[PDB]
A paper describes a structure:
The endoglucanase 3 (known also as Cel12A) of Trichoderma reesei (TrEG3) and Trichoderma harzianum (ThEG3) constitute an example of these CBM-less enzymes. On the other hand, these enzymes are particularly active in the amorphous regions of cellulose or in the hydrolysis of soluble oligosaccharides, which suggests that the catalytic core of these enzymes not only possesses the catalytic functions, but might also bear CBM-like motifs specific for interactions with amorphous regions of the substrate.
The concave part of the leaflets constitutes the catalytic cleft, which binds to the cellulose chains during the hydrolysis. Figure 1D shows the catalytic residues Asp100, Glu117, and Glu201, strictly conserved in the glycosyl hydrolase family 12. Close to the acid catalyst Glu201, ThEG3 has another acid residue, Asp96, whereas TrEG3 has Asn95. The simulations suggest that a CBM-like cluster of key residues located in the loops at one end of the catalytic cleft is responsible for recognizing and binding the polymeric substrate.
Author numbering: 1 to 226
The structure:
């Protein structure tokens, strides 16, 4: 027997697209660094994305094995400061054991609108969860308030890329926000050049190190407006 609408794969670079501009990617870019597997299953792509990633990784204790994620298409890149809003909602859960992984938004920006979309002048991460001894790069900058919620801000370098990571003080399995609030904070408190940086990508997923786990994304939405 068989079924259509089959949007499941354990392939390194499997990608499924549909609904309002969503693509779900297995993205096992660091699979070389370990042993095991990563799979994704798309339940539904409409106005929202529903999907799950299932994985088991051992070895390469200190290396990300993958970033299975959902993201939105951005055919036309726009300047951060010109973008009106970047609303998003996320409803998710993690199951498994010995989880060394995170759950986070990931966005890249650059002054070059044709920059490759998987890196940039800057990277903005918003971590909704963290398991085990894994954390963002850089060093703690302190706690900040964005739209009435606390985040611990980290700041560091990857080569020439500057990375800002906003980490929730406890797991947030159910969230709603606007990434514009985070850019505004960086612009007004950190000298982030919002007037000259283009949003290259807008992703949400998990970075697994080791363990065995299933990230279930009950629902995710995101868009870039005006």
């Amino acid at each position: 027997e068989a079924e259509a609408e089959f949007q499941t794969s354990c392939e390194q670079y499997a990608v499924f697209s549909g609904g309002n501009g969503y693509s779900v990617s297995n993205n096992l870019w660091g699979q070389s660094a370990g042993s095991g597997f990563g799979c994704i299953t798309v339940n539904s792509l409409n106005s929202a994305a529903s999907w799950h990633a299932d994985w088991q990784w051992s070895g390469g204790q200190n290396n990300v094995k993958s970033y299975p994620n959902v993201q939105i298409a951005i055919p036309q890149k726009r300047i951060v400061n010109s973008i009106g809003s970047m609303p998003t909602t996320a409803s998710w859960s993690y199951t498994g054991s010995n989880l060394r992984a995170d759950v986070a938004y990931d966005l890249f920006t650059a002054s070059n609108p044709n920059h490759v979309t998987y890196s940039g002048d800057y990277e903005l991460m918003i971590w909704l969860a963290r398991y085990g001894d894994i954390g963002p790069i850089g060093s703690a900058q302190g706690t900040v308030t964005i739209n009435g919620q606390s985040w611990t801000l980290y700041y560091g370098f990857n080569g020439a890329m500057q990375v800002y990571s906003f980490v929730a003080p406890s797991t947030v399995t159910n969230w709603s926000g606007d990434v514009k609030n985070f850019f505004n904070y960086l612009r007004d408190n950190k000298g982030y050049p919002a007037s000259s940086q283009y949003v290259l990508s807008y992703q949400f997923g998990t970075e697994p190190f080791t363990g065995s786990g299933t990230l279930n994304v009950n629902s995710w939405t995101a868009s870039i407006n005006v």
